Isoform SUR2B of ATP-binding cassette sub-family C member 9
Amino acid sequence: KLPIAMRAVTNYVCLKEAYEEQKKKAADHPNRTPSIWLAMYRAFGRPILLSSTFRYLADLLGFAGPLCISGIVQRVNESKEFLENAHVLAVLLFLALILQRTFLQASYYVTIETGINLRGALLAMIYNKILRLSTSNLSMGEMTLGQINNLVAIETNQLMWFLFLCPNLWAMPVQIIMGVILLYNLLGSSALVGAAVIVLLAPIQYFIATKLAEAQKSTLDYSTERLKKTNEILKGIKLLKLYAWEHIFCKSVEETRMKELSSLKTFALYTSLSIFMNAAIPIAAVLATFVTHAYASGNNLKPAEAFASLSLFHILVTPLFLLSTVVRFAVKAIISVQKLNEFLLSDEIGDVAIKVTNGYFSWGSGLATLSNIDIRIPTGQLTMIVGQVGCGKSSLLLAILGEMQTLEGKVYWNSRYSVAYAAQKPWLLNATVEENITFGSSFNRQRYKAVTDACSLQPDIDLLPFGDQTEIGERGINLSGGQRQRICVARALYQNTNIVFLDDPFSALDIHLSDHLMQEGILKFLQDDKRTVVLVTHKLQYLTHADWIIAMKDGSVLREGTLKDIQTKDVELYEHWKTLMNRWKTCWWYLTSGGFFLLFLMIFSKLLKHSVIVAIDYWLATWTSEYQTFYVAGFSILCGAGIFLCLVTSLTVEWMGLTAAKNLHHNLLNKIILGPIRFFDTTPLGLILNRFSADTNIIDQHIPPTLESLTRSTLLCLSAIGMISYATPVFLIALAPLGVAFYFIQKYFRVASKDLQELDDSTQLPLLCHFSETAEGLTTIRAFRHETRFKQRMLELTDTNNIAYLFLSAANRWLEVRTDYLGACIVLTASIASISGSSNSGLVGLGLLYALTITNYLNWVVRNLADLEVQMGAVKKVNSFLTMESENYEGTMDPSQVPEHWPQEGEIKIHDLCVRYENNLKPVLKHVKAYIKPGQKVGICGRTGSGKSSLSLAFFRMVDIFDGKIVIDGIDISKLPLHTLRSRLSIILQDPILFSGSIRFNLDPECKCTDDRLWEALEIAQLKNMVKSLPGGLDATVTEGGENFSVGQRQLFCLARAFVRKSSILIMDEATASIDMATENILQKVVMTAFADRTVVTIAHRVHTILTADLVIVMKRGNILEYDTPESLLAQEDGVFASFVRADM
Ligand SMILES: CC(C)CCC[C@@H](C)[C@H]1CC[C@H]2[C@@H]3CC=C4C[C@@H](OC(=O)CCC(=O)O)CC[C@]4(C)[C@H]3CC[C@]12C
Ligand SMILES: Nc1ncnc2c1ncn2[C@@H]1O[C@H](COP(=O)(O)OP(=O)(O)OP(=O)(O)O)[C@@H](O)[C@H]1O
Ligand SMILES: Nc1ncnc2c1ncn2[C@@H]1O[C@H](COP(=O)(O)OP(=O)(O)O)[C@@H](O)[C@H]1O
Ligand SMILES: CC1(C)Oc2ccc(C#N)cc2[C@@H](N2CCCC2=O)[C@@H]1O
Ligand SMILES: [Mg+2]
Ligand SMILES: [Mg+2]
């Protein structure tokens, strides 16, 4: 499989020991952080020393070119002592070249091996950190799941790619210095003038690296923010599309994209300037050197010395080809490792089954949310926790589990035992249903059947494509909320632990499913195993079954004991409870996106640049062919034109890249956000967010540099071929076999590369997904204490990905070795042809040194072409989304007919409405006919899967209608533009989607509302006091996903978000699912007293709420059964509504 040295386990252990030694060294000092760079050096240095040794030997052998060219030229110009023989020197040059290529490839192999080992070790380190970091980092905005995913995907790979190129940073300097030292021998003091111009690259490149570092840090910041906004959009597309807020968030994302593109333009300008200097300081150095020699040494250059010096200049230029690449990658890797080091230095976690005494706990801030927690959980009994929204129940659970730092008090666990946690926000991995329910336990069909029948999952799973073996979660078929929650509770029940913490498992479930889970699942199945159970529920009707009762108010336990104990001590609380219960082509498109003028300007400028650059060498050959003002003047004008064209060609390609990136991302976003909701339901969010993050990163930052390096290399190779063939017209014949050979090796490479490439992208996706599903749901993994198994799985997956990437790199090295030997053969053939069949004593030299150039740059041509193919793949992925269906916003009703206040009355008539989600699917709604008067209170009830939500989303045309007319105030909604319909009606969904920013930003993203109405709304939604007490008032922050607030408070914010709009029709779809009964009653009273004029349709979670409603509808499999007042339906014998009321009460 993977050799032991290359396993992620050993590399991780080595890097971890190095980093722990660094942490010791840091503990030695105050304000001296541990450094990843020294840890990595100490751990993985010896391989890098080996590769550096190979590189130095390669450079020393590369200096054989100058000597051999000098000898060959001198001999063409004019035993065993025949080593001067031209052919002998040519053969020695060929052998030196093959040996240099062997050493270079050995160095590359060692470096890539080390880079892959280090990538594995770093991913292991940050994965263990994920398993260690406290959730208060994500809850308070310290960081986000997206940032951690960015670490795993972009930043670690950026460090790895830099480490591939690392030996250059110290090898390129040396190779340059040696060159100067040799030039000085041939040319005397004149060569010191060129040495100064070359030395100036060090200050210049350091300055440019400073500027690039600043620009890259800014780009990374704005990329983080833009991806945050994009992810929040994609996750909440339903709410945005329902509120007509799509374009507002699109505009904000575009603003952040503009800032990111300004930072990218600074980075491109300074990258384009570094390329200009690396190219034009050699032109200037050649000028200075040879002009000075012309006017200092009276003796002219003999051809041998001239060509030796020119070859030394070529050997200097080769280092500077890759200097821009290495400075770019080093500047990116420095930022990357700053981010990694910030991540790895963060906050980390610190009878009677559980006994908490005098416990003050806080959510990683400094102010206590729980105080005076004196509780005990009796062993093997049912403990129920009851409290209004935001009273510390989930806080209490995650405190016992130790997930929030303790300020005072103790918890005793008569080290922690494995506790089965069913979190309030259910978490599902990307495995099958069976894997999520078993969750790392031996399959037992008897227990599995018992659990599945206690959670009523059987009818729901047999409706799935592959019953019980269908992939679930992100990247798989998306289950409804109730299905996901019941799968999570099934997971909790199936495990063989003794303590089961269930945090409100009945939020999404209806009355029948909830009662079934309570009777068969908790009271019967768990009490048979005699397992401790802690329930956090608002279902007060279940308090009769409770064995122990904890009551929580305002963060502190108000009273604790059996029901009778509470009745005897706190008569008030018991009476309150009783009252409440009432008892390719893509490449051409990328090039053309410039506009047919940037492309042709680029290509013509590059060709002219190389024409002049090669004319410089031809001119030097002709000039030194003597053994003057005219030659100096011609040389100067050629060099100046070369510098100018270098500047132009540098700018053009980067500008092309900028424009292409901007247009690609803009089209992608403005087409994704206009798609139908069916597209987002069907397509996994991963397949879209990856386009937005990884493919966008490639398009922005990876394609322009690869393309420019490819063009430079290919034109250097073509220039060398042209010069050689001109010097020796016979070489063209020799170009027939070799060229053909090229075409073959590449061919073979492809049929493997492609294959391996697919593998390397199919084995990386699991790994990344793991880092996701552990970053999310971390508290669950640490509640079951399955951290060891997840570490093992991460090591396995990273080993697999490393095997795949190692084979990919091995194929690349195969092709590179083959092309290097082909280039050595090209050099040999050109050398022989020039020695034997060239006219002048100067053309032999040009042919030889340009053959050397061919060998030097053909390798880069091949490598960069392969990389550019793999990246045009990503451009193809991004372009694929411009063929989406676009929701029809146009509308047909003339805007003149639509009044200025269209829902002015709020009377809805639904005539023969039949709704389906996709064509050739079951009609969820069947010939429903409804008539709600203006200013009428309508309550719709039914069992899960009865089309309540379909009937709700019908008004906003998020479900495709087969037949039926929905007339709101005399207008068929089918004619209106989508926005005038979706903006003038307000709907409160069941899932509390919440965006990052202030409270204001979540209540009115347009900022078109005064603070007074925001306070009115937050008063109706019962959140006025909590916001008044919050640090920043209405400007208080809301971290991504609303994690810093309770679930109930998230829902109440979602209710205020609807109350602000103040439209005439309010569709409340199970809005009080997570709200407790105490808050829910007062909230309903206030909403009825405030919206008494408007028309509200309430799809109710409990029938008690819709008892005081003007009209009641009961749905059953898409059919309205009873249509009358609640009194009539109650008085009907054996009626459905009457049965609902008994169960709910
Ligand atoms: C000119 C000849 C003799 C050698 C060609 C390369 C070298 C000049 C070396 C010596 C100094 C090196 C540069 C000096 C330091 C930096 C900055 C470094 O990034 C940072 O320093 C962080 C940014 C910051 O300081 O805020 C990235 C590598 C780089 C460009 C180095 C790249 C390789 C350089 C140019
Ligand atoms: N992840 C979190 N990070 C920081 N503060 C939090 C977090 N969750 C809740 N809080 C704060 O803790 C207080 C208690 O909320 P908690 O999380 O215990 O809700 P809960 O009572 O379990 O929820 P509900 O009963 O509505 O389902 C709230 O004021 C909230 O501000
Ligand atoms: N996103 C969806 N795409 C296709 N069909 C769905 C989707 N959601 C629900 N359904 C189907 O429509 C029917 C009614 O679902 P729904 O309207 O969600 O019921 P409820 O009113 O209880 O929410 C169900 O039988 C279900 O199979
Ligand atoms: C004028 C010369 C000495 O200086 C430069 C400057 C920039 C670049 C580039 N890229 C290349 C070169 C030399 N060439 C031209 C073809 C191969 C090579 O090394 C030039 O012969
Ligand atoms: Mg809760
Ligand atoms: Mg529903």
User: Anything to note?
Assistant: Residues 987-1060 form a domain with the Rossmann fold fold (CATH 3.40.50.300). The pocket of ETJ (ligand 4) is lined by residues 279, 282-283, 286, 313-314, 317, 613-614, 616-617, 712, 716, 719, 853 (CB under 6 Å). The longest strand covers residues 352-362.
